[PDB]
Amino acid sequence: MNIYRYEENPLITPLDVKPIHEGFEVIGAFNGGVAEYNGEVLLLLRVAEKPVSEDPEIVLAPVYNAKNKELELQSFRLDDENYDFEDPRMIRSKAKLEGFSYLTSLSYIRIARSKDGHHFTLDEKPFLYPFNEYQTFGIEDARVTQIGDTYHVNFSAVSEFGVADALVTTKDFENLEYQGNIFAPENKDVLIFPEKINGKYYALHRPSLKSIGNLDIWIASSPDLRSFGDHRHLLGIRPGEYDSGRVGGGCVPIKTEEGWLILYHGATEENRYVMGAALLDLNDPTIVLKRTKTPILEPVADYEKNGFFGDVVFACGAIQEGDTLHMYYGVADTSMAGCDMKISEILHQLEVEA
Template sequence: MKVYRYEENPLITPADVVPHHEQFEVIGAFNAGIAVYGDEIIMLLRVAERPISPDPEKVLAPVFNTDTQELDLIELRLDDERYDFSDPRVIRNKSQSATFEYLTSLSYLRIARSKDGHHFTVDEKPFLYPSQKLETFGIEDPRITQIGDIYYIYFSAVSPVGVGESMVSTTDFEKVKHHGMIFGPDNKDVLIFPEKVNGKYYALHRPTTKSTGNPEMWIAESDNLLYWGNHKHLIGLRSGMWDGGRMGGGCVPIKTERGWLELYHGATAEHRYCMGAVLLDLNDPSKVLARSNKPILEPEAEYEKNGFFGDVVFACGAIVDGDIVKMYYGVADTSMAGCELSLQAILDSLEPLE
């Protein structure tokens, strides 16, 4: 697959974002939702900030307190044998190794704006900040679907009771209306289609179970964008392939003459994240027509291979201009990058399902 990576990549790095909190450092500005608003391209960044501990023997875990509307910093000693600090992203209680007890950073959403799609300016203040009980560990990985004049923004809401998908809406990227959690824990990678199909709204989602099943892609339908049902399993993991470890939706589905094109991420068991595509029927998106056997984008550039969590390309938004797909994607769980691909080439690369 021929890919044109922007010369300006990475487009936004943590160094481009001033911390919102004193005595914090920005460790990630990535996995942004993408929208066109007026004459601007909006990049709604996930900004991850980590408290700087004054004591090298201790780590601070940020937790939003809904009673005080302030951040609490939980102080833990690195030699505390009850906890596992080996993963820089999370702090695990060794007695509950399958889950984490705290995150080492707090994520919120911040707008970056561009006229040309290559050079972005980051707003001074957060656009969305944790405010609800289901967001006390932060809000992450937004996607944006425009339907009419309304932009629906949905994101992972993280708290001690799990990770679910919450939604707000806006018409001006200033005022927002909160709609609550639309997919309960544990669920991520929700993508709402940009128009109704046969009178129904459709959404992709990625539930994760602790009993049986794998982190795979599902589809659901709704009459009102708030209550989702008729859930169906859409595509699964493929052992030994680029999407054999986990997968999830990437960009809002793109309507083409051949069907709904979904650009999704897949990872190997070794956590190497690539981008591929799946084609869904125009009139019945629960029907899979074709799928990528090989990735359309792999972590090859230095900024994709090295970072907070390396070997990751993770697209969250695309703008289609004729045959050009302008895809914006997170790199190495650290920064944002952009690239262009041919829509026709992506469609032609897909292997039809028998």
């Protein structure tokens, strides 16, 4: 791939964003959803914030209480032999390392806007902040699918009841309509297809599974973008390849004349995250036509490396301009970067590699 990485990268880091909670620091402004509205590019940033502890033997979980509508921090001793703090994103039971009891940060969504696609200014106030019992550990990783006048903003809703996927709709990003949890837990990486397709809407998704099953991309159909069904398996992990550990949807599917172009993220068991691509049949997007054997975007620039577990590029949206794609992506789980590439060139690598 001929990738053009923006000169300004990283576009937005933690130092560009001030914390909205007393005694918290911003640790991430990343995994931004992407829309065009009213002649600007909107990034729907995930801002993650962490309480500072003055006692370094105690770690704080920032939990939103839905009854009182405010944070209520919960303390855990690093010396508590019931827990494992080796993944600094989480407080884990030693008997359940595959999960978590708490996150060490809380996330919400904040908009940043650009005339030129390269220089961003934050909205003054948060866009979506935990508002209910499904979001007590945060709102994460907003994806934005526009269909005509309506923007569909869907996001991870984390609470003690699970990680679910929920939907807000809006025409102006000011008046918001909550549509509930469109996917039951445990799920994320939900990407709504940007048009109705032979009488049905579609969404990619990604069940995370306890008993059996890998971290694989699925797809569901909907008559109304409120209720989903006819769930199918779509793209699975591949041993020995860049997506040997997990896959999930990244950008909104892109209509091309060859199929729906799916820019998805893949990680190895080592947690190196890259973007790859798939092409789905145009009429029935449950059919996979092609898939890449090597990535289209991988961590190589310094700001894309030295995530905690690995180097990460994580693209959660893109603006199409003819054959040019302006791709925005999270980097190292802390910041936002931007790049351009050609759609014709992704299509060509799909053909060459299959």
